[PDB]
Design a binder for this molecule. Structure first.
Ligand SMILES: C[S@+](CC[C@H](N)C(=O)[O-])C[C@H]1O[C@@H](n2cnc3c(N)ncnc32)[C@H](O)[C@@H]1O
Ligand SMILES: C[S@+](CC[C@H](N)C(=O)[O-])C[C@H]1O[C@@H](n2cnc3c(N)ncnc32)[C@H](O)[C@@H]1O
Lengths: 336, 338
């Protein structure tokens, strides 16, 4: 309730937001797990059917210099692969993206489509590693597209096209040898309408690669458990879907699964720790950026606080049980 | 290997067999479960992929005398689990409950055409055909006497709506399509599920559905390879590389069919059914001996075959009961044409 403003204040230590989050982790686990497999399964199946009763996505801008501080060279807004705790944020971005390339079976000369390309992390990585490829990225953000185009000029890249559109409404009669959808489906609800649409963009014998945060076992809409659930109200003021690792297996009407992998929650957990450290290491430069963009020192402090809590809360949540609760799922599809 | 001989000569008590099986399941569980999800998933995906490079089924005198099945199995001769809504539910009731459950989850309606793959002695074929006089039910079997048994049930019950095709499902070809297809305890005999589901899916009519029930472990899948050199159960019961599916392995075989629904049922149900079989066998052991002595021509072969059946029932009752029935269990999957 009034709990947050005390922290916008700076009144509980990290250690105690960490402790609040563990309480919410456990209450979500208690809610989600069932005494028998018959129930566990019935609840996932029932949950998938209800997703087919929704819209594809809710019908609903971070300053670039702040992202240059928090994210890493590549402006990758999504997890890295950490071989160690000694892996740097920026090695982790590159590692995870080569992992994508290997699992999606990217080859030089393929046409490639990057749905929700953001600041072009993967779009620029693919385009530089395979100059024979023609890479098309889709974003609904003019700021992101002009930034990416600015990098293409800089690095001297001529194999990159950026279409400005809502993926939800994008229509084309061009098909692509490979399609990427990394951390997009977190923004979707009717997985069935989304995969149906994307499937018509897949070329003959093409592949769609999808990566999504998930719980290992159960799925759910972000809506408070208790009266005491601050974290959903605060982190997510516009409801969205935390998927489960296996839930896209139930959405194979227009695409078929070729391969399926998961990665431990330690990877996003580590990533979020690096985001928090870089934030706090440059905290003064961050306050200046936020004052300029948001117009006041108070509203700036509100956003710095939001981001620290986001990183703190989610680093803890994904570390749960050595990363074996919330985690990453990767799915390779072909058409039809 | 000399274990078996002393079993067959009636040394090793039922509790020793039960204890042996417990050891065997704990090795299987410890072989199968992995310390991380990424490994667990990788085991399963990799095992699924390897199935796609196999035969649909292995190629093959191991038929069961029919009077023995009348004793062991129960009124409809269902050779697959019953549903026990309790421990007071009888064998005969479990069969009818389970088969009504099939009729509801597969959405059967009067007048539909129905194909029953691997119909056995026709438990489901006859139950559906007696329940829905407007349906035409086609059963497929590779067994001459299973087909002749069913056509005689049709004579006795005065059903004109049942047709049995004598054929190997793996090789059968037809241009007919059906509103409803059943495959109950059939994929336990299959290896390449992909090739199997491809063939079958051509038999599904427009808006038709396919209902598959299979035994499985909850999490991981494997072939019956012996685990170590202490493993007697595997090549005693399965000497033919059959496959133990996992509850979700068919989610990875959706190239020609799409999942409409997916359920599991506790291993308690198959556990109690095997117990029921064992009781009826023991309660009629003299008649069983006679039936086997007659049909296999030996006192020796007869004891070997009674032993095998009792071991099979004791061991599988134990395995399916493991951890309150939450390890090995039943999976039911409903598919539409893709
Ligand atoms: C957390 S992700 C990051 C994207 C990119 N895969 C990456 O790793 O940086 C969110 C992205 O999805 C994009 N997005 C969400 N909904 C979209 C839509 N309907 N059309 C286009 N882009 C969308 C947003 O613009 C944002 O860049
Ligand atoms: C465990 S089931 C029992 C049958 C029946 N579906 C039931 O639930 O009572 C096994 C049946 O599959 C049949 N079967 C196995 N492989 C077959 C094949 N390739 N072609 C035809 N029938 C087959 C066998 O004849 C056997 O009766």
């Amino acid at each position: 309730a009034n709990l947050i403003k005390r922290i916008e204040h700076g009144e509980v230590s990290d250690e105690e937001i960490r402790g609040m989050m563990k309480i919410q982790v456990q209450k979500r686990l208690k809610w989600g797990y069932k005494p028998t497999h018959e129930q566990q399964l019935a609840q996932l199946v029932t949950f998938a059917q209800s997703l087919k009763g929704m819209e594809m996505a809710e019908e609903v801008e971070i300053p670039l210099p702040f992202l240059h501080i928090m994210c890493g060279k590549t402006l990758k807004f999504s997890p890295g692969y950490f071989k160690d705790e000694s892996t740097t944020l920026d090695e982790s971005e590159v590692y995870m993206m080569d992992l994508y390339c290997e699992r999606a079976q990217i080859k030089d000369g393929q046409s490639i489509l990057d749905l929700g390309c953001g600041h072009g992390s993967l779009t620029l990585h693919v385009a530089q590693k395979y100059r024979g490829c023609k890479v098309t990225g889709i974003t609904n953000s003019v700021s992101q597209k002009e930034f990416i185009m600015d990098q293409c000029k800089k690095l001297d890249l001529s194999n990159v096209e950026i279409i400005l559109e809502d993926v939800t409404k994008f229509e084309t009669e061009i098909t692509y040898d490979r399609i990427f959808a990394v951390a997009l489906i977190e923004h979707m609800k009717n997985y069935e309408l989304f995969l149906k649409k994307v499937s018509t963009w897949i070329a003959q014998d093409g592949l769609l690669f999808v990566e999504h945060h998930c719980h290992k076992v159960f799925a759910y809409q972000y809506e408070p458990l208790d009266e005491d659930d601050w974290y959903t109200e605060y982190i997510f003021p516009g409801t969205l879907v935390m998927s489960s690792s296996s839930i896209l297996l139930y959405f194979q009407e227009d695409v078929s699964v070729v391969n399926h992998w998961t990665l431990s929650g330690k990877h996003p957990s580590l990533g979020f720790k690096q985001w928090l450290k870089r934030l706090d290491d440059n905290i003064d430069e961050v306050k200046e950026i936020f004052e300029s963009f948001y117009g006041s020192k108070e509203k700036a402090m509100k956003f710095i606080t939001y981001w620290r809590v986001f990183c703190i809360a989610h680093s803890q949540m994904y570390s749960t049980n050595n990363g074996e609760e919330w985690m990453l799922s990767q799915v390779l599809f072909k058409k039809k």
